[PDB]
């Protein structure tokens, strides 16, 4: 059950949801497995926020174990398209898809909590059918693999070769280690 | 069904749910298994209360049997980040994550009812796959154990060696016994 909060202004009292109240403050939540229904919801929020103030930054909280590649790219393209900078904050865990959307934030505005965990790996998939069809899907997923690595290297600042070798299998990176790799810029510990 | 209560104010009477009414009094409820969905809900409540009054303490009730570690490390990082002290009151049961989130409260503002039970154990996991991947996942879970063991020693005051010898297997502690280890500070029995 989502609790209801009150917002006091000189227009009248308005009762808001905890999630809806934070949306007014340029805060978007990315929770759970990434899929098409939730991805389109996040996309709608981004387009709505830039209408109110296309100059202020948009905060995106990422706590997810990963998800569909297509759904994530929808959010990635939307982030890099809108004029305002998207600040990514990692709380809890950030998997392959969560990490890609984490490092995709604006340079210098990517944060991670001290006990947060990050994971990166190559995309998964599979297809059952004729051999000719398998080759079609086999080449398609490979293109995505290379495309994701190229984008990952661009934001992290690493070389494409290093990303491929490191993403060959699961690689767990803590908050201090993610800073060296380039997935994030700083770590938030206390409110200073 | 959640009962609805009324609150009398100068502007007039307003109807809110029981949980929302208590939220106005800086009271957050942590019930059931810990997951990403409920964790983000608690994080939002903590952030909302901080903005309203960053100098008033926050009360967090803990009647949970445990859950995901990552979901519980976001709440912990959020409590240590916000300026106001987060008081923790154990109500009935406090497992690994609940106890970890019970001793993480502000020193001097931790409580445990007289007939409450606290249980501390080591992180549980498991992975199925190639031996190379098993090693990667095995090393990571061993880091979380050491990381969580160190945080508990800092908040309880016990030596790291003792925590390692006491968390190897399930350790049940009553409220009077928790006061001697450091998980809590005092026991609430009556109003005065």
């Amino acid at each position: 059950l989502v609790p209801m909060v009150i917002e006091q202004t000189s227009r009248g009292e308005r009762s808001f949801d905890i999630y809806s109240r934070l949306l007014k403050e340029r805060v978007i939540f990315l929770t759970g497995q990434v899929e098409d229904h939730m991805a389109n919801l996040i996309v709608a929020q981004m387009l709505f926020l830039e209408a109110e103030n296309p100059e202020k930054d948009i905060y995106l909280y990422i706590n997810s174990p990963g998800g569909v590649i297509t759904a994530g790219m929808s959010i990635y393209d939307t982030m890099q398209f809108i004029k305002p900078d998207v600040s990514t904050i990692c709380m809890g865990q950030a998997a392959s898809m969560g990490a890609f959307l984490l490092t995709a934030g604006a340079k210098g505005k990517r944060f991670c909590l001290p006990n947060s965990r990050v994971m990166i790996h190559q995309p998964l998939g599979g297809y059952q059918g004729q051999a000719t069809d398998i080759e079609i899907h086999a080449r398609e997923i490979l293109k995505v693999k290379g495309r994701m690595n190229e984008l990952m290297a661009l934001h992290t600042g690493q070389s494409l070769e290093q990303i491929e070798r490191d993403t060959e299998r699961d690689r767990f990176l803590s908050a201090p280690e993610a800073v060296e790799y380039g997935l994030v810029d700083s770590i938030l510990t206390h409110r200073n | 069904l959640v009962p609805m209560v009324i609150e009398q104010t100068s502007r007039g009477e307003r109807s809110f749910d029981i949980y929302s009414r208590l939220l106005k009094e800086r009271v957050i409820f942590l019930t059931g298994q810990v997951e990403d969905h409920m964790a983000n809900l608690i994080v939002a409540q903590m952030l909302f209360l901080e903005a309203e009054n960053p100098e008033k303490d926050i009360y967090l009730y803990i009647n949970s049997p445990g859950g995901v570690i990552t979901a519980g490390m976001s709440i912990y990082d959020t409590m240590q980040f916000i300026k106001p002290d987060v008081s923790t009151i154990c109500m009935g049961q406090a497992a690994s994550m609940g106890a970890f989130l019970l001793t993480a409260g502000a020193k001097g503002k931790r409580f445990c009812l007289p007939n409450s039970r606290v249980m501390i154990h080591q992180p549980l996991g498991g992975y199925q796959g190639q031996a190379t991947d098993i090693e990667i996942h095995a090393r990571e879970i061993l880091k979380v154990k050491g990381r969580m063991n160190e945080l508990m020693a800092l908040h309880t005051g016990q030596s790291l060696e003792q925590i390692e010898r006491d968390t190897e297997r399930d350790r049940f502690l009553s409220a009077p016994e928790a006061v001697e280890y450091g998980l809590v500070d005092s026991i609430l029995t009556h109003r005065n």
Partner: peptide, 22 residues
């Protein structure tokens, strides 16, 4: 003696509107 007299005001209230998830 020329002296002015004040008058009360409308005394309007501030209504509230509640919003639910759906």
């Amino acid at each position: 003696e020329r002296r002015g007299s004040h008058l009360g005001l409308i005394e309007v209230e501030k209504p509230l509107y509640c919003v639910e998830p759906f």
